[PDB]
Design a protein around this ligand. Structure first.
Ligand SMILES: COC(=O)c1ccc(CO/N=c2\ccn([C@@H]3O[C@H](COP(=O)(O)CP(=O)(O)O)[C@@H](O)[C@H]3O)c(=O)n2C)cc1
Ligand SMILES: [Zn+2]
Ligand SMILES: [Zn+2]
Length: 523
């Protein structure tokens, strides 16, 4: 018995077709993804295959002005229109709190929403009871397929789930629900969840009874053969994990931003064992046309969003590299732009006096969520900025010891090479790293633009000197494991809204040209 699993993860409010780097589509003839083009590929498959399951492994929430305005109503509407069969809750579905998930998404979704490891205590229990489930048993033809859900254990450290939601260990929560399914003679079990390629491999290995693991969160690109675009595969598709009980368990992911539709065809025997599986993510490129009905529906919704693009903030003569393969691995000019906006807006505050000379900046590269293209004649709109900075935080001012900053720089590359968001973009700092050294002893040079000097210049960081640094409030409060900043700072003040800072800066410069200058080097 064959089943075709179609799957998406980390769409991140990319309802419209986007450029190759998933930023605002300018050249419509070369644009990819979007729910309308996804509809066309799903329909084509459903026409040709009788046993199809369309599944989302989370993080449809957050990413573009679609989310800023509709707060999740666009997720329910366009997922309902695509006829999704099931969706696992991601960390980003709690970005607007529990009420921001319950009221627009859970109560309007037609498909089941799953998570077996989220438990609800207090008065939330009665309200959210049944609005999401640990599993769902689905009829597929004349057979039945069980889907168990999971959600990142780290969600309270990345989102706003509140204090009436406990996030259990994935494996501990999943095993009893998989066992319950097997006692109900549900022999075909998909584990659909949002925890990352690493936890997915672990779930395939340790959770007996699981046949397939469909995942997300790590934005993993898996491919068998020649990749169709710039994404480099982190392994074959499907990735095969040999479980402890000898079974071969396929693990799949479909990159992110609606760019690819994950496609896995599975051949099962009558006892629900996997004989074989094969597939590849389908690159949703311009060859596949956008479904006219979905496009005209997206366009009707798009009328409300057109007042953000209507206002041009400024112009850029350069590509604003806000990608994850640059901003989490090396110096990217988008981190440089954000830090120069942070420092400049603060310095124009002639009302204060304590932070009126701050010239140092640190910025978590994972906080930079999108690049910005320059082929619109340089034109930068609020809509573009909204995708680079969707968390709506502030730019806080902090007083740190040199040893505290040195520890933050060690932390910045302690587990380098995993697309980890803790890699820092700097301003008024020149750091050199030697990755061929033990984690914690990789900073080989660190110079900062001094302040106890009349004519600044980058001078060696002193371990016991005090520095005034501007950074996102997220870092100021210990986010990304930057607990040393929260534990060791000497003063912490709130600043202006991150998007209003960068927006005001660009309008004042009128033409920006951030570049890679040697702020971060490797030895
Ligand atoms: C309206 O407000 C929100 O939407 C709102 C959402 C959240 C908060 C609290 O969390 N704030 C964070 C959380 C994470 N990060 C960054 O994201 C990285 C994780 O990204 P990925 O590895 O790509 C996994 P993902 O797909 O789930 O994002 C972290 O490593 C870190 O570098 C942040 O910068 N911030 C500011 C507050 C508000
Ligand atoms: Zn995501
Ligand atoms: Zn996530």
């Amino acid at each position: 018995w064959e089943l075709t699993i179609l799957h998406t993860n980390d769409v991140h409010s990319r309802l419209e077709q986007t450029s190759e780097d998933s930023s605002k589509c300018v050249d419509a003839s070369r644009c990819m993804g979007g729910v309308a083009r996804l509809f066309t590929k799903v329909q084509q498959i459903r026409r040709a295959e009788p046993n199809v399951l369309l599944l989302d492994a989370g993080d449809q929430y957050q990413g573009t002005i679609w989310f800023t305005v509709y707060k999740g109503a666009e997720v329910a509407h366009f997922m309902n229109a695509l006829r999704y069969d099931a969706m696992a809750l991601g960390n980003h579905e709690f970005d607007n709190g529990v009420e921001g998930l319950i009221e627009p998404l859970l109560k309007e979704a037609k498909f089941p929403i799953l998570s077996a490891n989220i438990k609800a205590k207090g008065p939330l229990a009665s309200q959210i009871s049944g609005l999401y489930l640990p599993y769902k048993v689905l009829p597929v033809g004349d057979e039945v397929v069980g889907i168990v859900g999971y959600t990142s254990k780290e969600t309270p450290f990345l989102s706003n789930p509140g204090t009436n939601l406990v996030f259990e260990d994935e494996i501990t929560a999943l095993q009893p629900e998989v066992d319950k399914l097997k006692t109900l003679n549900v022999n075909k079990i998909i584990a659909l969840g949002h925890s990352g390629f690493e936890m997915d491999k672990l779930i395939a290995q340790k959770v007996r009874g699981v046949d397939v693991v469909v995942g997300g969160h790590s934005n993993t690109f898996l491919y068998t053969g020649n990749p169709p675009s710039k994404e480099v595969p982190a392994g074959k598709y499907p990735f095969i994990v040999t479980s402890d009980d000898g079974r071969k368990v396929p693990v799949v992911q479909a990159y992110a931003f609606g760019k690819y539709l994950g496609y896995l065809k599975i051949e099962f025997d009558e006892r629900g064992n996997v004989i074989s599986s094969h597939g590849n993510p389908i690159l949703l490129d311009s060859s596949i046309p956008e479904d006219p009905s979905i496009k005209a529906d997206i366009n009707k919704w798009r009328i409300k969003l057109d007042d953000y693009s209507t206002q041009e903030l400024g112009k850029t003569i350069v590509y604003l590299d806000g990608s994850s393969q640059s901003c989490r691995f090396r110096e990217c000019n988008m981190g440089n732009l954000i830090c120069d906006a942070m420092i400049n807006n603060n310095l124009r505050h002639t009302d204060e006096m304590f932070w009126n000379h701050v010239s140092m900046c640190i910025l978590n590269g994972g906080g930079i969520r999108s690049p910005i293209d320059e082929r619109n004649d340089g034109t930068i709109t609020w809509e573009n900025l909204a995708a680079v900075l969707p968390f709506g935080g502030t730019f806080d001012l902090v007083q740190l010891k040199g040893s505290t900053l040195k520890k933050a720089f060690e932390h910045s590359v302690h587990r380098y090479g995993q697309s980890t968001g803790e890699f820092l973009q700097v301003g008024g700092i020149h750091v050199v790293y030697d990755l061929s050294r033990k984690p914690g002893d990789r900073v080989v040079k660190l110079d900062v633009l001094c302040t106890k000097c009349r004519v600044p210049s980058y001078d060696p960081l002193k371990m016991d000197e005090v520095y005034k640094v501007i950074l996102p409030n997220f870092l100021a409060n210990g986010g990304d494991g930057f607990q040393m900043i929260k534990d060791e700072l000497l003063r912490h003040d709130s600043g202006d809204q991150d998007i209003n800072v960068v927006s005001t800066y660009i309008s004042k410069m009128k033409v920006i040209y951030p570049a890679v200058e040697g702020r971060i080097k490797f030895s």
